[PDB]
Amino acid sequence: EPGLTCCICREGYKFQPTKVLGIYTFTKRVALEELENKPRKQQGYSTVSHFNIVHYDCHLAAVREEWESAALQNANTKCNGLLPVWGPHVPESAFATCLARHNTYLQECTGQREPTYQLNIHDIKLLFLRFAMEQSFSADTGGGGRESNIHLIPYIIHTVLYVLNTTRATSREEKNLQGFLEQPKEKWVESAFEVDGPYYFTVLALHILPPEQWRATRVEILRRLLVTSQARAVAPGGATRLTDKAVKDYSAYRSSLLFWALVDLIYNMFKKVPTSNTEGGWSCSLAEYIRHNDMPIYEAADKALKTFQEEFMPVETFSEFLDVAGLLSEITDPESFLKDLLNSVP
Ligand SMILES: [Zn+2]
């Protein structure tokens, strides 16, 4: 079996083309936005994974839901969910059933009302932020790292895309995203402390903008992340104006730039993905690509993590970031770009 295989029965799509495969996950309730300027922060959830894979049928048979039992097939690391993937010959009714099962798993471990695609987008955002903040992937589960969790990312994306496409919500979110991009500069500092802020809308863009539109938008996203980092560094308690517009130590911007880098690297994984199909645009064509390309995606994710770890993480200055990011032909002088951008904010 060249592709994803169930660790219980050792079979995948070659011998079981219609059996749903799933990824063991561990999810916990967290604040959506730690910088939210409110004593009661809006709650969501953050998922991690060791990227251990089982059939939904095989897991449910061994249960005879009991996650103490499942941990033994999960390399002795904690799990409380089973994120389904949608194989090319798996019937949609079987996938949808297992996705409903996973949403029940998510409710039971997060005290959530209902897992929405918006909360799943925040989940991806929080996962990206764990890469970018160099926070532990294994402290709660006992095992897992950047390697296992980079491989989870395409499959959480697919669950967002599946719901976006089945409920016909993409065009609405395209308008929401354009609304964010059209916010005047007098709004940027406030957006830095909102739940649905630049980090959220960047992850939303990955789900609905094709690679060329990301190319035409990524520098403006970079501006939004740089201003967001400035406001959060100088006024962690919240602000509406940028009182301190002076360039700070690179630590002020480091995590936001790693966040940008990870998004850019995932777009690079999907660089040649068809941009429309019979059913819709990017949100549809990317979902179809993910269903059919487990192994090419596995290869591209390892390469993306290699670039992230070997090139972006050692970056120490904004000029070095632009070099590694391949942005120097679009941003001539890093020093002037950052200084002028921050001074431009009210
Ligand atoms: Zn199996």
Residue numbers in the entry: 4833 to 4896, 4902 to 5183
Article sentences:
Diffraction data were collected, and a 1.8 Å structure was solved using the anomalous signal from a single zinc ion present in the protein. As such, we consider this subdomain a novel fold and refer to it as the UBR zinc-finger interacting (UZI) region. Our experimental structure confirms the structural role of conserved residues Cys4838, Cys4841, Cys4890 and His4887 as zinc coordinating ligands. However, residues essential for coordinating the second zinc ion (referred to hereon as the distal Zn2+ site) are conspicuously absent. However, the SP-RING maintains the distal Zn2+ site, rather than the proximal site, and lacks the extended βAB sheet. Thus, to our knowledge, the UBR4 zinc finger has unprecedented RING-related architecture, and we refer to it as the hemiRING.
Via an allosteric mechanism, the UZI subdomain modestly activates the Ub-loaded E2 (E2∼Ub).
